[PDB]
Design an enzyme around this catalytic site. Structure first.
Site, mmCIF file in Angstrom:
data_model
loop_
_atom_site.group_PDB
_atom_site.id
_atom_site.type_symbol
_atom_site.label_atom_id
_atom_site.label_comp_id
_atom_site.label_asym_id
_atom_site.label_seq_id
_atom_site.Cartn_x
_atom_site.Cartn_y
_atom_site.Cartn_z
ATOM 1 N N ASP B 45 0.819 -1.205 0.000
ATOM 2 C CA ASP B 45 0.000 0.000 0.000
ATOM 3 C C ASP B 45 0.856 1.259 0.000
ATOM 4 O O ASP B 45 0.439 2.286 -0.555
ATOM 5 C CB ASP B 45 -0.951 -0.016 1.201
ATOM 6 C CG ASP B 45 -2.075 -1.030 1.036
ATOM 7 O OD1 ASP B 45 -2.572 -1.185 -0.104
ATOM 8 O OD2 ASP B 45 -2.459 -1.674 2.034
ATOM 9 N N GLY B 46 2.041 1.206 0.619
ATOM 10 C CA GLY B 46 2.968 2.324 0.523
ATOM 11 C C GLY B 46 3.366 2.624 -0.909
ATOM 12 O O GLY B 46 3.340 3.780 -1.351
ATOM 13 N N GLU B 120 -5.265 9.803 4.620
ATOM 14 C CA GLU B 120 -5.626 10.755 5.665
ATOM 15 C C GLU B 120 -4.625 11.903 5.685
ATOM 16 O O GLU B 120 -3.545 11.838 5.089
ATOM 17 C CB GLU B 120 -5.692 10.087 7.051
ATOM 18 C CG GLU B 120 -4.321 9.799 7.655
ATOM 19 C CD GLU B 120 -3.646 8.607 7.005
ATOM 20 O OE1 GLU B 120 -4.256 7.510 7.017
ATOM 21 O OE2 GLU B 120 -2.517 8.778 6.485
ATOM 22 N N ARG B 145 -7.174 19.712 22.997
ATOM 23 C CA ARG B 145 -5.874 19.603 23.641
ATOM 24 C C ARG B 145 -5.500 18.130 23.719
ATOM 25 O O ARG B 145 -6.262 17.334 24.266
ATOM 26 C CB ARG B 145 -5.897 20.203 25.044
ATOM 27 C CG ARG B 145 -6.052 21.684 25.050
ATOM 28 C CD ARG B 145 -6.243 22.205 26.454
ATOM 29 N NE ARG B 145 -7.096 23.391 26.465
ATOM 30 C CZ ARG B 145 -6.643 24.620 26.654
ATOM 31 N NH1 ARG B 145 -5.348 24.824 26.849
ATOM 32 N NH2 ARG B 145 -7.482 25.650 26.656
ATOM 33 N N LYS B 162 -8.498 3.685 11.793
ATOM 34 C CA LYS B 162 -8.940 2.487 12.498
ATOM 35 C C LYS B 162 -8.208 2.326 13.831
ATOM 36 O O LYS B 162 -8.822 1.993 14.853
ATOM 37 C CB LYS B 162 -8.723 1.257 11.606
ATOM 38 C CG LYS B 162 -9.142 -0.039 12.280
ATOM 39 C CD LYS B 162 -9.084 -1.229 11.348
ATOM 40 C CE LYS B 162 -9.844 -2.388 11.967
ATOM 41 N NZ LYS B 162 -9.085 -2.969 13.106
ATOM 42 N N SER B 163 -6.892 2.592 13.839
ATOM 43 C CA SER B 163 -6.092 2.467 15.059
ATOM 44 C C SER B 163 -6.494 3.487 16.118
ATOM 45 O O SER B 163 -6.283 3.255 17.314
ATOM 46 C CB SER B 163 -4.606 2.629 14.724
ATOM 47 O OG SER B 163 -4.227 1.622 13.809
ATOM 48 N N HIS B 220 1.300 9.971 5.101
ATOM 49 C CA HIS B 220 2.646 9.672 5.623
ATOM 50 C C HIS B 220 3.768 10.475 4.956
ATOM 51 O O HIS B 220 4.945 10.126 5.088
ATOM 52 C CB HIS B 220 2.987 8.186 5.512
ATOM 53 C CG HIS B 220 3.504 7.596 6.786
ATOM 54 N ND1 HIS B 220 2.952 7.890 8.015
ATOM 55 C CD2 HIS B 220 4.522 6.734 7.024
ATOM 56 C CE1 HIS B 220 3.607 7.236 8.956
ATOM 57 N NE2 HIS B 220 4.562 6.526 8.382
HETATM 58 N N1 LIG Z 1 4.889 2.803 6.279
HETATM 59 C C1 LIG Z 1 4.896 3.307 7.651
HETATM 60 C C2 LIG Z 1 3.529 3.338 8.316
HETATM 61 S S1 LIG Z 1 3.020 1.821 9.087
HETATM 62 O O1 LIG Z 1 4.173 1.205 9.670
HETATM 63 O O2 LIG Z 1 1.892 2.126 9.914
HETATM 64 N N2 LIG Z 1 2.494 0.813 7.932
HETATM 65 C C3 LIG Z 1 1.211 0.999 7.248
HETATM 66 C C4 LIG Z 1 0.335 -0.237 7.313
HETATM 67 O O3 LIG Z 1 -1.037 0.093 7.028
HETATM 68 C C5 LIG Z 1 -1.444 -0.568 5.842
HETATM 69 N N3 LIG Z 1 -2.330 0.296 5.083
HETATM 70 C C6 LIG Z 1 -2.038 1.445 4.326
HETATM 71 C C7 LIG Z 1 -0.725 1.972 4.178
HETATM 72 C C8 LIG Z 1 0.328 2.514 4.030
HETATM 73 C C9 LIG Z 1 1.601 3.229 3.920
HETATM 74 O O4 LIG Z 1 2.045 3.720 5.183
HETATM 75 C C10 LIG Z 1 1.572 5.049 5.458
HETATM 76 C C11 LIG Z 1 0.272 4.979 6.226
HETATM 77 O O5 LIG Z 1 0.485 4.374 7.514
HETATM 78 C C12 LIG Z 1 -0.677 4.631 8.287
HETATM 79 N N4 LIG Z 1 -0.313 4.692 9.699
HETATM 80 C C13 LIG Z 1 0.565 5.558 10.299
HETATM 81 N N5 LIG Z 1 0.650 5.419 11.601
HETATM 82 C C14 LIG Z 1 -0.238 4.390 11.879
HETATM 83 C C15 LIG Z 1 -0.637 3.778 13.084
HETATM 84 N N6 LIG Z 1 -0.154 4.114 14.286
HETATM 85 N N7 LIG Z 1 -1.564 2.800 13.012
HETATM 86 C C16 LIG Z 1 -2.054 2.463 11.814
HETATM 87 N N8 LIG Z 1 -1.756 2.964 10.615
HETATM 88 C C17 LIG Z 1 -0.837 3.929 10.717
HETATM 89 C C18 LIG Z 1 -1.312 5.928 7.750
HETATM 90 O O6 LIG Z 1 -2.654 5.674 7.340
HETATM 91 C C19 LIG Z 1 -0.406 6.301 6.563
HETATM 92 O O7 LIG Z 1 -1.188 6.779 5.473
HETATM 93 N N9 LIG Z 1 -3.107 2.006 3.825
HETATM 94 C C20 LIG Z 1 -4.162 1.213 4.282
HETATM 95 C C21 LIG Z 1 -5.554 1.338 4.144
HETATM 96 N N10 LIG Z 1 -6.145 2.320 3.460
HETATM 97 N N11 LIG Z 1 -6.330 0.414 4.751
HETATM 98 C C22 LIG Z 1 -5.738 -0.568 5.437
HETATM 99 N N12 LIG Z 1 -4.435 -0.781 5.639
HETATM 100 C C23 LIG Z 1 -3.698 0.157 5.041
HETATM 101 C C24 LIG Z 1 -0.176 -1.045 5.140
HETATM 102 O O8 LIG Z 1 -0.493 -2.183 4.343
HETATM 103 C C25 LIG Z 1 0.670 -1.389 6.361
HETATM 104 O O9 LIG Z 1 0.160 -2.594 6.918
#
Ligand SMILES: NCCS(=O)(=O)NC[C@H]1O[C@@H](n2c(C#CCOC[C@H]3O[C@@H](n4cnc5c(N)ncnc54)[C@H](O)[C@@H]3O)nc3c(N)ncnc32)[C@H](O)[C@@H]1O
Ligand SMILES: NCCS(=O)(=O)NC[C@H]1O[C@@H](n2c(C#CCOC[C@H]3O[C@@H](n4cnc5c(N)ncnc54)[C@H](O)[C@@H]3O)nc3c(N)ncnc32)[C@H](O)[C@@H]1O
Ligand SMILES: NCCS(=O)(=O)NC[C@H]1O[C@@H](n2c(C#CCOC[C@H]3O[C@@H](n4cnc5c(N)ncnc54)[C@H](O)[C@@H]3O)nc3c(N)ncnc32)[C@H](O)[C@@H]1O
Ligand SMILES: NCCS(=O)(=O)NC[C@H]1O[C@@H](n2c(C#CCOC[C@H]3O[C@@H](n4cnc5c(N)ncnc54)[C@H](O)[C@@H]3O)nc3c(N)ncnc32)[C@H](O)[C@@H]1O
Lengths: 261, 261, 261, 261
Positions: B45-46, B120, B145, B162-163, B220
């Site tokens: 997805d990245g 997002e 805040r 979702k998280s 991101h």
């Molecule tokens: N690369 C470092 C950020 S990673 O460590 O959190 N990994 C991202 C994870 O997610 C999945 N994903 C993505 C993606 C992607 C690319 O990252 C950037 C995105 O990472 C998300 N992100 C950031 N901090 C997060 C957190 N604490 N918890 C959850 N997600 C978080 C944020 O949305 C951002 O756009 N879009 C969706 C989607 N549409 N549906 C469902 N799953 C989705 C992807 O397959 C991977 O499992």
């Protein structure tokens, strides 16, 4: 035109109702509680929900108005001191109507029964364990084990749905929202956890796994259903109509009820 | 027609890309990474998010396809073994397009900068305390805040949203969803808590209270913004288009990624 | 010494019980289900909870052991294939005992009834609205409006408590934990929201506001109580004792049941 | 005896400090900010946290008192109008001390650095993705992917911990509580979700997976650590001591700060 007025039944609401009827007597307005075109609810949101269910067979030819004699009032957004102004403005007409989406619940057996909800429909077990298969547009999505499930309208999202962790949705969105009540999640049992928001024409079906007796609530009317084969949810084709005389935006209503007033 | 292929850059994805280019060489298909009409993303997805941002100025004349070489893939819903079938079906055309809503972020200073998000946009402070006034259609809704805020598209609701406790929304709903990151709530400080879902044409404005430096992320890509007067969110008028060759419903995608596969 | 064996009652558990009794017949071991010193439960956590309640008047002179014939088993942490080894080690003694805290529930009327819980005690209304005043060591803490309340032991925190958002507590901590079920929070109604963790000798009293009929559960034994004046919770002075033959740490049990195994 | 007074530094707090010093001048009391036995903090909880860290090498020979000149004050539970009464009672001694548990954080490199926390210690990444292995008493419990983690003392549970969904723990319980910040949970990534409560002598170790740079906060002192091999948490052997002159129970403090006052 034709109108009626329901009251919560305490002294405050009854006398307000009697004074409004008296003020209406001074215009071309006929009290008719069989085929009103205007339904005024005087009380709280419970009173307003009763008014909706009392007339849910003539929803398309009725505009609702709520006056809150106590606190809150997400549906009853008129204060008692403005009753005279309401009579006058409502007598002269020239008001716009706004429409909120409704939820349709179908309960099948082994016949069919349908219900309309303004807030939500919920399902719980008959005292034993609640287990249902959740099927979305004929696709098996999850097996739910827990206390129950709640399907909310948009205007219902500030009610039970909110207490279950659901999102607050603006009522211009034609959707329904499913929230879980206390689901089990371990290595063996698995639900999505998150609230789910569904558009028009999506059908969510609950199908029993073992026990087939359930407590089904529609806007806090709670009925034990036996020999249930399926519970189906979809956004209704019908809508509730509000007479609107002033601008009182939904997000301001939310602010006033939960943030401060 | 014109197409290009991005790769995550590991051996698996690069060789898949080279084999697909070779298969395309057998049809009336021209490799063009300047004005493609088809963008294939090979990775996760990245990788897919990078492909979207690479072409976000020609979104209306492009259909995207994702192939997942590893795990998950909410956007990349094609397996590598079906690459030959994809080439053939995509070469012959006769596919339907589906469109997902996008989020527009405007950052004002003291000029204007706009961004498009597929997942997002989030806001956090510059290391100090995060305090912002949340204004909905010019109405002050709350003073927030906490750690930050997240505004998600519908297809983004399965990601960061979702998280943070947000609801999962079907991408046919034209909306954006605001979730809180760790807000303070005591006797002095007060937020709504619940996620908020907004329709098209609603504008959510974040306005600084004291500190005016913020870290703003768009899918991101995280950029420090200084001297910020306002951050504005609204559902974009632009949409992302996917080439669709098979039925793979959103709720099945959700089931496959979070429940089981 | 004296021992007994309960069974879930399916073929698998009954035959395991009969084979263990036969193996015990080869040592100085007497089957006695009136005054056993060892209680073996064969089944799941439900079976184990029944064994605890069957002997809750002789908790101080009994060590419990659980064998899980199906899945999970937070209390029944022995596999069926190790039954022969269990017989042999348990026959030779030389085992250490570990003790988990218990929860005491007192229900007053207008007489007194007390119960012991290994998982939790919960309170819900009799079908109407649930409203109770929560009093902590004689200090009025909050008026709770919602679906109900759950008071968990430490070993109970991985059960219902977990589904309600509660924290997981190591069972060496002598405490009880209160979680809310779907509380109303608006401008008029206000609860703490967070789970509350109480030490030994703290007393939590629930006192009715209007309706005085409640459904009270103790380890999923659910009893309708009428004319209730007070429900009191405190960490019990009694403790459950487990015969322990190997190191199986609580956090590993948690890992095995919720993370992976 | 020896005492000192810190001030938030606004006019209100400075003049209160100067008036208290003047009142102390009328007793056998010596102003000494090098080796005080009494530390008075005048301000809010931030001011009080600074006073604790200023003297954290002489915690065992110091009793702390907080006066709140503004709002809240979970640690500063004295009003400014009672300053004269505080001087008099504190000058005459005959007060009881109460002790709250503390959290020890050890950061290892590739040397060792230790910190004491009164509220919490948190860990976040250096701007990239946060991934750590969570090891409980040398047992690998989970691989955490998300925004960060928070380890709270009991008196810290009403602070950041509360905003992250953690339970509120009475400070007589010698424990620490781990909460997650926005963890990813899908088919590939898996955390426990629930807050975790640990007794004395349990050690929680965070171990890097890829990136080894982290932002580590101890009571809102936030320091970038590089080349980190391990972050270890345990309940400290040291304790903070409060001079107590009246009964002000913890649960009443909680009620006053979050429910109403
Ligand atoms: N690369 C470092 C950020 S990673 O460590 O959190 N990994 C991202 C994870 O997610 C999945 N994903 C993505 C993606 C992607 C690319 O990252 C950037 C995105 O990472 C998300 N992100 C950031 N901090 C997060 C957190 N604490 N918890 C959850 N997600 C978080 C944020 O949305 C951002 O756009 N879009 C969706 C989607 N549409 N549906 C469902 N799953 C989705 C992807 O397959 C991977 O499992
Ligand atoms: N009467 C006994 C159920 S009462 O004790 O929970 N009271 C209901 C409370 O809510 C408010 N309310 C209503 C209403 C109403 C009439 O009750 C029936 C409804 O009560 C809801 N309900 C049931 N169990 C709940 C729970 N545990 N937590 C929260 N709400 C709960 C459920 O929605 C049902 O339709 N619709 C909305 C709305 N649209 N927006 C915002 N607020 C709304 C109402 O003003 C009152 O404050
Ligand atoms: N039998 C009908 C209730 S069952 O459908 O929810 N199944 C119970 C499930 O749990 C597990 N379990 C038990 C157990 C057991 C026996 O049930 C009675 C107990 O069921 C709990 N319960 C009730 N409603 C629940 C809900 N909505 N969500 C989660 N749990 C719920 C409640 O604790 C009660 O004592 N103690 C623990 C423990 N100590 N650690 C971890 N897991 C535990 C058990 O292995 C099974 O997976
Ligand atoms: N100064 C900038 C961080 S402030 O903007 O979040 N303000 C802190 C707020 O809290 C209160 N507070 C404190 C305090 C204090 C001093 O700050 C540092 C502390 O701020 C906490 N903090 C950081 N990010 C947070 C967040 N997103 N949500 C909630 N709290 C957060 C964190 O605990 C840190 O130690 N200890 C406790 C306590 N023991 N009981 C109850 N309330 C407590 C304090 O009265 C104030 O209302």
């Amino acid at each position: 035109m034709k109108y009626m007025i329901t009251s919560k039944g305490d002294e405050k609401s009854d006398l307000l109702r009697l004074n409004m009827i008296a003020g209406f007597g001074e215009y071309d307005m006929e009290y008719d509680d069989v085929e009103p075109e205007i339904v005024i609810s005087i009380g709280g949101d419970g009173t307003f929900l009763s008014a909706f269910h009392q007339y849910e067979e003539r929803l398309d030819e009725i505009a609702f108005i709520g006056i809150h004699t106590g606190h809150l009032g997400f549906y009853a957004d008129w204060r008692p001191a403005e009753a005279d102004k309401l009579v006058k403005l409502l007598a002269k007409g020239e008001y716009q109507k706004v429409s909120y989406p409704l939820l349709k619940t179908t309960v099948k057996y082994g016949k069919e029964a349908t219900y309309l909800a303004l807030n939500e429909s919920t399902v719980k077990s008959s005292g034993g364990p609640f287990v249902v298969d959740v099927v979305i547009n004929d696709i098996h999505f999850e097996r739910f084990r827990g206390d129950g499930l709640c399907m909310s309208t948009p205007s219902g999202t500030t009610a039970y749905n909110k207490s279950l962790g659901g999102a607050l949705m603006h009522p211009s969105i034609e959707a329904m929202q499913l929230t879980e009540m206390a689901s089990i999640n371990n290595r063996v049992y698995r639900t999505i956890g998150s609230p789910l928001v569904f558009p028009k024409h999506h059908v969510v079906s609950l199908q029993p796994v073992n026990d087939k007796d359930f407590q089904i609530s529609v806007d806090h009317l709670s009925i034990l259903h036996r020999d249930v084969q399926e519970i189906r949810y979809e956004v209704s084709a019908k809508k509730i109509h509000f007479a609107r005389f002033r601008s009182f935006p939904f997000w301001r209503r939310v602010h006033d009820s939960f943030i401060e007033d």
